[PDB]
């Protein structure tokens, strides 16, 4: 009856909002490209507060954290490649021969022994040096003359070899007055009302791994193997599957390389590939045929729920495009592998090994181009020794064609971050609340 | 006792969550120019701005340093005709803001002048 307005400060009510999310990291100290030393240390007690009775709406396909991480990672790379060497003198006519013939037909030319004239510390005196270049990084002229692949499109910048391309888990945090909402639903689709919700100040550790087709070193599902797409009935929307069991992959570049520093000027030093100690072998990846067949069947079962128990789905290899998207391209110890995946997506499944593994023939690039703008590329300096990384495959990036056929791909860098930021959402706190009661001032 | 944590009573009734206001009150506020450094500086200036806008409104209403202040603005039933028991023992603060959202600007003015006139009345009473 006698009701007046009463103001409350600190009411549990929030609205959806976009804000700047700062990074948190764990104490590890050289320096990585992700500048994880420049982040605030994460609390050793990552507080999670469960929001009982709360049901929130999520939409990973409109989430801004994936749009903010997509640009932060690009900025972290632009920042790290800023003070490094500009290899513009490397855009010169190369005299190339095969290095060490008699291997296996079209394999001597996969990497070349290229010699070229180069500037020195004195601008008036040249030097004739040589370097081992992979075939994917050079093109002919039409004689045995070659040039770097990037010279007619993009400038080139070699990474400061003291920086590490190793991904370090990143914790995105919301500023004070904001909150991160986690959808703790074990069988969550990515959109819609999430019944179990908790709030956190910072997200979990998110390694900024940029792979293709296969999602590496990611987070796993707790139940079944979920499948996420905004319009699954649309064939042009990438399907982002996420395993619950990690199917291990073993990649290696067995060639024992040597890095030969070449001074291209005062202070500037281009790191060439000296020679190969030992055998000239082929880089490849192993994945247990048994575990991959088992995990490929789980995806089939969860794909039946969107296309019928009776339909037949088929896995085919990539249908074309750039090199980074037709292969399982990724980074392993510094070198950038490009793995043929025809041996992983070559299976048809009906309506209703056990010892060996399936190997993946991988090629290697050094002049890797930029994924966004054109006119820019990076020279990955050669890594000495033998490279062999062991990583988990926790998801895929498939694509339907409109009985059913699924091929992989995904050159978009933000699809990787959707696979880890799907369960998070940014909201702003509005602690002012007016409501009636029979209370009056004075 | 209970202590549900920060926003722990977001799904609780308005009368229940109205007893855990200090929980949300203390979490509303707690240089190299790198990509992370610029990011963190923006998070710092934004937090102090949002915190002081609410403290400003809390000041022009005569509610400085109050979690629960009572006003003199009567409840126009056109805002919400719901009774007290079906509000504090029923609704949550989230859905309450959802149906009072249209009139939140109307109320913010009535509280602003009720405080301006009250302090003018208090000066007249202490003038003797």
């Amino acid at each position: 009856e006698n009701l007046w307005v009463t103001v409350y400060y600190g009411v549990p009510v929030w609205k959806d909002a976009e804000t700047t999310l700062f990074c948190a990291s764990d104490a590890k100290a050289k320096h990585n490209v992700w500048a994880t030393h420049a982040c605030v240390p994460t609390d050793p007690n990552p507080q999670e507060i469960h929001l009982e009775n709360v049901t929130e709406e999520f939409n990973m396909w409109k989430n801004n954290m994936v749009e903010q991480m997509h640009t932060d990672i690009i900025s972290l790379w632009d920042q790290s490649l800023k003070p490094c060497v500009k290899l513009t003198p490397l855009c010169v006519t190369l005299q190339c021969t095969n290095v060490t013939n008699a291997i296996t037909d079209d394999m001597r030319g996969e990497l070349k022994n290229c010699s070229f004239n180069m500037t020195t510390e004195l601008r008036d005196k040249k030097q004739k040096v040589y370097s081992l270049f992979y075939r994917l990084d050079v093109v002919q002229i039409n004689n045995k003359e070659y040039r770097l692949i990037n010279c007619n499109t993009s400038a080139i910048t070699q990474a400061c070899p003291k920086v590490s391309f190793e991904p370090i888990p990143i914790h995105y945090c919301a500023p004070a007055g904001f909150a991160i909402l986690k959808c703790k639903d074990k069988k969550f689709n990515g959109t819609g009302p999430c019944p179990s919700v908790s709030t956190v100040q910072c997200t979990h550790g998110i390694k900024p791994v940029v792979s293709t087709q296969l999602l590496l070193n990611g987070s796993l599902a707790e139940e079944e193997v979920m499948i996420r797409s905004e319009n699954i009935t649309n064939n042009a929307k990438n399907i982002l599957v996420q395993f619950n069991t990690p199917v291990q992959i073993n990649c290696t570049r067995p060639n024992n390389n040597t890095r030969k520093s070449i001074r291209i000027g005062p202070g500037q030093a281009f790191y060439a590939t000296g020679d190969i100690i030992g055998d000239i072998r082929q880089a490849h990846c192993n994945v247990s045929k048994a575990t991959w067949n088992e995990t490929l069947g789980k995806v089939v079962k969860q794909l039946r729920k969107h296309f019928g128990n009776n339909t037949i789905i088929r896995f085919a290899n990539s249908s074309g495009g750039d090199l980074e998207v037709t292969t399982h391209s990724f980074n392993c110890g510094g070198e950038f592998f490009y793995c043929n995946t025809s041996g992983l997506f070559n299976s048809t499944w009906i309506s209703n090994g056990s010892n060996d593994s399936i190997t993946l023939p991988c090629r290697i690039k050094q002049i890797i181009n930029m994924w966004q703008r054109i006119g820019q590329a990076m020279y990955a300096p050669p890594i000495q020794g033998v490279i062999r990384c062991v990583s988990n495959i926790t998801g895929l990036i498939l694509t339907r064609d409109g009985t059913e056929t699924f091929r992989p791909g995904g050159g978009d860098m933000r699809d990787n971050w959707r696979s880890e930021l799907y369960k998070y959402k940014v909201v702003k706190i509005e602690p002012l609340g007016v409501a009636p009661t029979r209370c009056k001032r004075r | 006792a209970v202590f549900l944590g920060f926003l722990g009573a977001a799904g609780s009734t308005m009368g229940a969550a109205s007893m855990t206001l200090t929980v949300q009150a203390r979490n509303l506020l707690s240089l190299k120019l790198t990509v992370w450094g610029i990011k963190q500086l923006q998070a710092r200036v934004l937090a102090v701005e949002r915190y002081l806008r609410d403290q400003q409104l809390l000041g022009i209403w005569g509610c400085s340093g109050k979690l629960i202040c009572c006003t003199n603005v009567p409840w126009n039933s056109s805002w919400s005709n719901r009774n007290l028991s079906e509000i504090w023992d029923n609704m949550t603060w989230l859905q309450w803001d959802k149906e009072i959202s249209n009139y939140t600007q109307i109320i913010y003015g009535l509280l602003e002048e009720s405080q301006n006139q009250q302090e003018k009345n208090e000066q007249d009473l202490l003038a003797l």
Partner: nanobody
Amino acid sequence: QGQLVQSGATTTKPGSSVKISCKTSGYRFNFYHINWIRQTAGRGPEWMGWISPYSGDKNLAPAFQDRVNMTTDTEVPVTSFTSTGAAYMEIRNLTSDDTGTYFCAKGLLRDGSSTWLPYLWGQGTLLT
């Protein structure tokens, strides 16, 4: 809003055990109790018992202490404040003297002294 569609009005004979369904809509099914009320012809209307779709805690009259099984399945979130639920009712040593119209009614408020009070009822089901 809120709806509570009930099952069919079929009939059986003594000694059996029928199940009554009550499907909810337009309100968070977990926030209010579900009551079962009986309007017999040879007796005044009787309150059989309520159950909590949130805590699973049930409470029935001693006249139905060991003869009635009340169960509810978890809800399905529709929006932030809308879900769909279902409540089930059973009888054990059943005769033909329990004939009448059976209703399901959700609780009144979420807190206070009239929490479980049957507020929003269903359309009822005729029995044997």
